[PDB]
Design a protein around this ligand. Sequence first.
Ligand SMILES: CC1=C(/C=C/C(C)=C/C=C/C(C)=C/C=C/C=C(C)/C=C/C=C(C)/C=C/C2=C(C)CCCC2(C)C)C(C)(C)CCC1
Length: 134
Amino acid sequence: DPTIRKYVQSWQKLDVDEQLALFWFIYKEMSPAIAEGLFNQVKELNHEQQLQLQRDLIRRVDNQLSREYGSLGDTTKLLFWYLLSQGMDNATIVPFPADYKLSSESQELLEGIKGLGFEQQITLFRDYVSPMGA
Ligand SMILES: CC1=C(/C=C/C(C)=C/C=C/C(C)=C/C=C/C=C(C)/C=C/C=C(C)/C=C/C2=C(C)CCCC2(C)C)C(C)(C)CCC1
């Protein structure tokens, strides 16, 4: 389980967009009210602002939405990130680009994360999204 922190640290060394790409592809290889609430504030924005929030959450930017995120529990935070992925498959959230290919480093992490067990993956994801926001 020290290997989980290494995934988190490796994940946190990538570019912000690279991080979001890795998170999205993992989603393709696979408290709710509070999450649905924050999720509504997201899809109520313009598609561009939807992108800037997710970046701002990874960058720990200090704004109102990041503060709300940062004030939630780990479970809610991860559920929020799930509803974002669902909102993207349903075209509710700004879509993901087809022509994006993962860096050599990212594809290594992904296959490495494909090796972990479902519960270690959940543990990984919770720790990755837990310190985001403000
Ligand atoms: C590419 C790019 C972009 C974008 C991107 C994005 C936007 C992404 C996103 C991504 C995402 C948005 C992702 C997500 C993910 C999610 C996930 C991965 C989730 C998971 C979850 C889970 C795992 C859960 C579990 C559970 C529950 C539900 C609760 C408790 C119990 C259990 C455990 C069952 C742009 C446009 C700028 C362009 C350039 C770059």
